[PDB]
Structures are given as C-alpha cells and as structure tokens.
C-alpha cells in the first residue's frame, strides 16, 4: 500500500496494555509470529494530513535505543503504529517500582542508553519536543528506548502544545519554551537533563512541592532541579550543563555522550 503500511489483517488484538500518550494500547502479533504493540490514535485528536506525512520521517528513523517501528496503518480509523513490545513497560513506572533495588551504575546505563538515541534524533534533525521518563520504555533486557518521539507535533487539542497549556510538559520544559514557544535541538537537551534527574531521583515527579503555572514561573525566574541523593557531584554536573538559560551554552548530544563515557570509566 506504502513501503511502511501494514494489513490491518496480518494483526490480532490479544491483551490491554492500558491508555497510552495520544492513545490506547493494545498487546498482538503481527503475522501470527512477532510480538507487537499497537498504539491507535484517537480518531480526530490529530491532523492527519500532516501527521501522515510526517509519520513516513518518522518511519525511517533506525536506531538501536529508538523503540522499532514495523508499520502503520494509515488506510483506516483509528489509524495504528505498530511497534515492538517493550516487556518492561515506560521507564517511570520501572523506577518507581521499589522491588527494584538499583545501583547506579544501572542509572547511568539507563542515561547512556537514551542520549545515544537522542544524539541520533539530533543527526537526524528530528526533535522529540516532550522527552520524559513516561514516554521511555524498557524492554525485557533492561534496556531503555526513546518513544512518542516528536508525537505531539500535530495534536490539535490546544491545551497539549501550548507552553501555557494545562497538559503541556512545563517540568520538562525550558525558559525559551514556557515564555516564548521556542523549541530546538536545545529544549531536548534541557528535557534530558530533566529526565536524568528523574532516573537519579528513582522516578520522583520534578519540582513536586510546585503546581504547573507554578514551575513555569519559576524556571523562568532561574530555579533549576536540586542535586537527588544517588547523584555524584560528576554525575549532577552532566544534568546541571543541559540547563543553561542561555540555549547556545548548553551542550550537543554527542558531548553528553562522551560526558557520561567518561563518568562510567572512572565510575568503575
Ligand atoms: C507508564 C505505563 C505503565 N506502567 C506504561 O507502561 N505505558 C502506558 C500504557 C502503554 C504502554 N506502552 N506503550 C507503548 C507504545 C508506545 C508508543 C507507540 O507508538 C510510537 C509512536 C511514535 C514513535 C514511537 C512509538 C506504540 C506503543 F505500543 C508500548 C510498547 N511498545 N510496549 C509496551 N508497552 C507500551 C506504556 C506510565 C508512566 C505509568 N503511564 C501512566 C498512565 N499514562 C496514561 C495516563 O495518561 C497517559 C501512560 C503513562
């Protein structure tokens, strides 16, 4: 039909993986073989013309910490994006489980493994625009995936990519965004520094003593995420760069990568 359209057919529904961000999720496999995970996008929450088309990017995508795309199905409603099955779950939910006893080196290989897969989304020029311990995920290697990203691009409901939105990602979220709407590669540093912050806190929510409109003014007025406990002084050093209020001061994908390297080497 296209190159990454699938038979809706070749599909079969087994398990309710729960509601996910922009839509339900359903456990299957696909060609009665593959172990697949189905994502339906709630019918009109989207504009589908440009979401199509920017799916076909978005399909191309290979990496390695990306979570692997099969296909979609774009020829009926709700339209699906078929992937792999994570056995782990979102990353959130992963930490926040205390049965899980991490050490940190277990943190900092969960941190290795997404700016890996966010310094290809920047080779790539492709911005994720709401990176976060919810949308990672984590497959039955313990291994982190990026996912959902650059989802919210074309979600029509204001109140989701509004920087004033009452369920836009202000936690995560830096000055130039909150106040002016400016997204780049550099708001996706400023995510990822959240997002370690997160894996160090073992899954606690940012700033959770502040409200939303709370935080918006007060990341714009200079506060920054204290240093969690399990955090070295190297490690939080790393976070703390991606937080520049100056966007062109803050480091590449590629140096954070090279940053926390460097930490694991000496971490041994
Ligand atoms: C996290 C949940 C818990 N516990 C959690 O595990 N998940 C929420 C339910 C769905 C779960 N899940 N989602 C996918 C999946 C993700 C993305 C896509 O599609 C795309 C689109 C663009 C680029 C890449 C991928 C398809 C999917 F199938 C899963 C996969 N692949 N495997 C396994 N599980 C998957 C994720 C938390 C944070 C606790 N949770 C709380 C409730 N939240 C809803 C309330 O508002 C949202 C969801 C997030």
Redesign the pocket.
């Known amino acids: 039909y296209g190159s990454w359209e699938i038979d809706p057919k070749d599909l079969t529904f087994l398990k309710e993986?729960?509601?996910?961000?922009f839509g339900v999720?359903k456990?299957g496999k696909w060609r009665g073989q593959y172990d697949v995970?189905?994502?339906m996008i709630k019918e009109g929450s989207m504009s589908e013309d440009e979401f199509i088309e920017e799916a076909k990017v978005?399909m191309n995508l290979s990496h390695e910490k990306?979570?692997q795309?099969y296909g979609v199905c774009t020829k009926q409603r709700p339209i699906f994006?078929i992937?792999?099955?994570?056995?782990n779950?979102?990353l959130?939910?992963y930490l926040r489980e205390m049965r899980h006893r991490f050490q940190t080196q277990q943190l900092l290989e969960m941190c290795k493994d997404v700016c890996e897969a966010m310094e290809y989304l920047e080779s790539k020029q492709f911005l994720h625009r709401d990176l976060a311990?919810?949308n990672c995920?984590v497959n039955d290697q313990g291994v982190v995936k990026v996912?959902?990203?650059?989802?919210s691009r074309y979600v029509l409901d204001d109140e989701y990519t509004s920087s004033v939105g009452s369920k836009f990602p202000v936690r995560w979220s830096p000055p130039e965004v909150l106040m002016y709407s400016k997204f780049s590669s550099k708001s996706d540093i400023w995510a990822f520094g959240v997002l370690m912050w997160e894996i160090y806190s073992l899954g606690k929510m940012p700033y959770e003593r502040f409200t939303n409109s709370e935080t918006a003014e007060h990341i714009a007025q200079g506060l920054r995420l204290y240093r969690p406990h399990l955090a070295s002084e190297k490690v939080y050093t790393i976070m703390y760069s991606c937080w520049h209020e100056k966007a062109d001061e803050r480091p590449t994908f590629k140096i954070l990568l090279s940053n926390i390297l460097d930490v694991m080497d000496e971490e041994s």
């Open positions: 993986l729960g509601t996910g961000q999720v456990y995970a189905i994502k978005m990306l979570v795309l994006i992937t792999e099955y994570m056995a779950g979102c959130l939910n311990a919810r995920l996912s959902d990203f650059g989802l």
